[PDB]
């Protein structure tokens, strides 16, 4: 358990698994949804991931 939580930092994974993935932080999320308003309200048949990643970087 000692080597797993220091050399690979197992606990940081849980701490970032709530804050981000389970939407546990929300300073991030409200600005994220704000930037993703005009893009996601537009129909997603013409949506490709490269437009998401670049605005995601600014938001994070």
């Amino acid at each position: 358990l000692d080597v797993l939580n220091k050399k690979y930092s197992l606990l940081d994974h849980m701490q970032a698994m709530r804050r981000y993935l389970l939407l546990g932080q929300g300073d991030f999320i409200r600005h994220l949804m704000d930037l993703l308003k005009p893009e996601l309200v537009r129909p997603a048949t013409t949506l490709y991931q490269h437009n998401l990643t670049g605005i995601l970087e600014t938001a994070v």
């Binding site: 939407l23 546990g24 932080q25 929300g26 300073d27 999320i29 409200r30």
Partner: protein, 420 residues
């Protein structure tokens, strides 16, 4: 988003200085602007991020004929802010006319600060109602701000002048200011002078130096009102999401505030909820009934106890309000700030819409009408004269505040499908 503060009036500039000093102490900020040595938390709303991480307060000080600004000038905290945002009669119409002729350069300063900010959310106002110079000019600026920016929010912190008398013309001035506040503001935070004075004489044994203490009180209240934004959680980390619950209708936008410790320098949340529902913890003065109540808690909280507390206080029915509809209490949680010693770390705030302030307004409506009827108290001021030779703007504001009191009393009834 990003909020700019405006401060005007002598007491307003006092509480603005105290508020900025309180946030500099609260966050990891030196009074030079430098980040502290031991500084996670957000300072990206009221503090510009400058070149040496200098959290320069996003504040615009408006004044005319400065006296207390000189005392601001010789201070170690005169290097935290003032990137030159400081710009140099006690009648409403006097301050209105003076603000009229210099509207352009101060609006240019506002646009300069808007350009300096990347985003914008709101202009929060430090105001003193019937403060002399603050009256009239503050109404003028409020009208200008609502005109130029129809996409932004306006919050007003102000005290209501009541000291049980003094000035025979101030109810006229406060009535005109209230007319402007009703129409040209989006949400109003109301404060009472005699109530805070009585609490200051209560918990302490002072009679004169009330200003120095009331600055602390309003600073604590305002910082508490912003803590969940300043210390990021995830419930209502925007102003607009918080304000949306508090305003049930655009005619009732006045908010009653409290503070759970009257002095905080290990009770549970159940006790202080019962304390907060007692009116001695409430700092703003048929049945008067709340429409909607919100509370914000910051301290050492167990998350199961808040649920069972809500159960028990709900069953005890200590919420002496009868609405006309489905509106209920709302809970919120915030973080206790570091670097500040706090005994009994549990501290709460309340934001509630209560009809009782109508009676206070009615007191002024009685007074002004009385002085209107005898007509020996308008005193024939000249600014009032060429601004309005017939003085029908006072009648207009009387009409509006009458409609406001009627809207209040229609809201008191168990149907609001009928209006007043």
């Amino acid at each position: 988003r990003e909020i700019i503060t405006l401060q005007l009036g002598q007491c307003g500039n006092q509480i603005g200085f105290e508020f900025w000093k309180q946030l500099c102490a609260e966050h990891g900020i030196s009074p030079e602007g430098i980040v502290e040595e031991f500084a996670t938390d957000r300072k990206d709303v009221f503090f510009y991020q400058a070149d040496d991480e200098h959290y320069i307060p996003r504040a615009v000080l408006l004044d005319l004929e400065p006296r207390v600004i000189h005392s601001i000038l010789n201070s170690p905290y005169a290097k935290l802010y003032n990137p030159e945002n400081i710009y140099l009669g006690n009648n409403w119409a006097s301050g209105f006319s003076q603000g009229e002729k210099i509207h352009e350069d101060i609006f240019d300063i506002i646009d300069r600060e808007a350009d300096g900010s990347d985003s914008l959310e709101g202009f929060v106002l430090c105001h003193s109602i019937a403060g002399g110079t603050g009256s009239g000019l503050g109404s003028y600026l409020l009208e200008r701000l609502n005109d130029r920016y129809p996409k932004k929010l306006v919050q007003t912190y102000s005290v209501f002048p009541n000291q049980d008398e003094d000035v025979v013309v101030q109810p006229y001035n406060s009535l005109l200011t209230l007319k402007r506040l009703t129409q040209n503001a989006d949400c109003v935070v109301v404060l009472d002078n005699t109530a805070l004075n009585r609490i200051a004489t209560d918990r302490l044994h002072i009679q004169n130096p009330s200003f120095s203490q009331i600055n602390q009180l309003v600073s604590t209240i305002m910082s508490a009102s912003t803590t969940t934004l300043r210390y990021p959680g995830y419930m209502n980390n925007d102003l607009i999401g918080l304000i949306a619950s508090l305003i049930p209708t655009p005619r009732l936008h006045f908010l009653m505030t409290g503070y759970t410790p009257l002095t905080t320098d290990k009770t549970t949340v159940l006790d202080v909820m019962r304390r907060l529902l007692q009116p001695k913890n409430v700092m703003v003065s048929t049945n008067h009934c709340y429409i909607a109540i919100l509370n914000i808690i910051q301290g050492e909280v167990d998350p199961t106890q808040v649920h069972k507390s809500l159960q028990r206080i709900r069953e005890r029915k200590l919420a002496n309000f009868i609405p006309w509809g489905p509106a209920s209490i709302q809970v919120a949680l915030s973080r206790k700030s570091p670097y500040l010693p706090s005994a009994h770390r549990v501290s709460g705030l309340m934001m509630a819409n209560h009809t009782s302030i109508s009676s206070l307004f009615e007191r002024t409506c009685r007074q002004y009408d009385k002085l209107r009827k005898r007509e020996a108290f308008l005193e024939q001021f000249r600014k009032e004269d060429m601004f309005k030779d017939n003085f029908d703007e006072m009648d207009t504001s009387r009409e509006i505040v009458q409609q406001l009191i009627d809207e209040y009393h229609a809201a008191t009834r168990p149907d609001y499908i009928s209006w007043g």
